[PDB]
């Protein structure tokens, strides 16, 4: 979970009257002292509702260490250790067997480079990246009882690096290259394409990963390691890196041993499952939402991407609104989405899905892998509350849920036992997330670089709203919608309505949600 770290950050910022609080910054180095520690403790007790003391701040003076302290799980330890498929990976493999996802669970990473890179040096750099991170060369075979991992040696890991000439626009080409299917049993879950053309000034570097090997949080380590490996091979040298604290299989083995078995009543898995069974009781099968077409018998996973650019003034107003009411920016976006669905006639019981990153352990905080568990955040909007009252409801719902974020979502589905159907995702069909793209990626590969948005031809749910920060000040709302249900114009209107909800909430949080 990251919400604790963000809350401690804004409490640091407010108490210090300071606007450069990072996760690893020391409280006393930023200008804090003993008297100011009282305000940090008091504010963290009122916001997180956990017993915090002055001693906790002195022993854990950074927002990352303090957040971890405030939340018995063994640390990740290293282990030719055999690969261990995490429950995320098994569930991601499973969704490709249940549905034809059309590449919806491929994650893209597109970087425009002012110079056309050297394909041979790039291929060598990718081989080094694949050799460093075992999860990028871990195959998944379908056996009798399900998935079985196969780790390829670096010499046997045949990388997929190629140059593609773009006659067409270039943004449409990225969509289609992203959705190209992976054969998880034979091909490594990483494809690399270099797009050049007469309309492409320089080149566009596209990293297509299957989610089984990487989440959106892996963008920073992927780019950093690929940059250092490219600049080393360009200089005729193997990259010289500090060894990895752990591979993904180390994290997976540690997590599953600590999770325990669902039959053990005292295991963390069972105790968290019992919470979700009660928290998700009498859940709506599906929210009644106005769609352009009725739900088809099978979710085709066809989709589009509607974007809403946010003005910098609104982004800061959202930041100010979050710090004002003691909630994270995600909680404001999640409350705004709930208001939007409520005003569309969905009712007072709004279950929204949301990803929660399991990157608290410092050995996996900056590593490549999939750490996003899916949680059902069930917010109630009865009693015609104000947006401020809703922000308090959302925080109470989120913090209670974030304390049980380790139960695998597939196990949660199995315990809640909703009416199953391949026409819809279970327990929720609208997901909301807050994402931050990597910062300081403007001067990579010895050139000028910038992340490029990839329009998607796929969708995982009915609706997926993401508050995406680009890493260099800007922010925008992305709505990944199912084309089976919504036309592109309807999605564009939906995301513009979400921005209006936020603008109205920042202006006056005392207005009723109705
Ligand atoms: P943070 O680390 O920034 O601040 C710590 C703080 C507030 C400086 C405390 O450590 C603190 O208050 N230190 C001073 C404590 C102190 O000096 N107590 C003695 C006060 N004098 C007496 O009590 C009196 N009996 C002296 C006798 C005559 C020896």
TrEMBL record:
It comes from Thermobifida fusca (strain YX). Belongs to the ATP-dependent AMP-binding enzyme family. This is Non-ribosomal peptide synthase:Amino acid adenylation. Residues 286-306 are annotated as: Disordered. Residues 1-71 form the Carrier domain. (R)-4'-phosphopantetheine binds at residue 34. It comes from the Bacteria.
């Amino acid at each position: 979970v990251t919400a604790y770290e963000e809350i401690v950050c804004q409490v640091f910022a407010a108490v210090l009257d300071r606007s450069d609080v990072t996760a690893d910054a020391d409280f006393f180095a930023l200008g804090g002292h003993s008297l100011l520690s009282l305000r940090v403790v008091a504010r963290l007790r009122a916001l997180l509702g956990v017993d915090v003391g002055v001693r906790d701040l002195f022993e854990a003076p950074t927002p990352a260490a303090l957040a971890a302290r405030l939340t018995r799980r063994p640390a990740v330890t290293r282990r030719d250790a055999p690969p261990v498929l995490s429950h995320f990976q098994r569930r991601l493999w499973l969704i490709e067997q249940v549905y034809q996802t059309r590449g919806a669970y491929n994650v893209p990473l597109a970087v425009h480079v002012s110079d056309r890179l050297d394909l041979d040096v790039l291929r060598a750099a990718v081989r080094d990246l694949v050799a460093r991170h075992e999860v990028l060369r871990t195959l998944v075979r379908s056996s009798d009882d399900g998935p079985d991992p196969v780790l390829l040696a670096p010499e046997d890991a045949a990388v997929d690096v190629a140059e593609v000439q773009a006659a067409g626009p270039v943004a449409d080409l990225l969509a289609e290259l992203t959705a190209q299917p992976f054969d998880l049993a034979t091909q490594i879950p990483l494809r690399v394409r270099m797009i050049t053309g007469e309309q492409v000034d320089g080149c566009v570097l596209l990293l297509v990963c299957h989610h089984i090997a990487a989440d959106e949080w892996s963008f920073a380590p992927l780019l950093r390691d690929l940059d250092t490996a490219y600049r080393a091979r360009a200089a005729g040298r193997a990259p010289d890196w500090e060894p990895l604290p752990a591979q993904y299989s180390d994290y997976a083995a540690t997590l599953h041993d600590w999770l325990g078995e669902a039959t053990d009543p005292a295991s963390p898995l069972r105790r968290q499952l019992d919470y979700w069974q009660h928290a998700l009781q009498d859940l709506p099968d599906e929210l009644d939402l106005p769609t352009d077409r009725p739900r088809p018998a099978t979710a085709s996973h066809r989709g589009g991407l509607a974007r809403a650019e946010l003005p910098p003034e609104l982004v800061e107003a959202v930041r100010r609104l979050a710090a004002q009411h003691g909630v994270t920016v995600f909680m404001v976006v999640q409350a705004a989405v709930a208001v939007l669905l409520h005003r569309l006639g969905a009712g007072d019981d709004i279950p929204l899905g949301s990803p929660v990153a399991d990157r608290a352990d410092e050995a996996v905080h900056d590593t490549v892998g999939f750490f996003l568990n899916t949680l059902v955040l069930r917010v109630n909007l009865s009693g015609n509350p104000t947006f401020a009252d809703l922000l308090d409801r959302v925080r109470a719902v989120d913090l209670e849920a974030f304390a049980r974020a380790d139960a695998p979502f597939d196990a949660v589905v199995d315990t809640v036992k909703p009416p199953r159907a391949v026409s819809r995702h279970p327990l929720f069909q609208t997901m909301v997330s807050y994402q931050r793209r990597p910062s300081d990626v403007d001067r990579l590969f010895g050139a000028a670089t910038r992340l490029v948005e990839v329009p998607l031809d796929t969708a995982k749910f009915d609706l997926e709203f993401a508050f995406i920060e680009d890493g260099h000040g800007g922010a925008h709302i992305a709505l990944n919608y199912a084309a089976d249900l919504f036309d592109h114009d309807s999605a564009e209107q939906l995301v513009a309505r979400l921005r209006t909800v936020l603008e109205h909430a920042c202006a006056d949080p005392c207005r009723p949600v109705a």
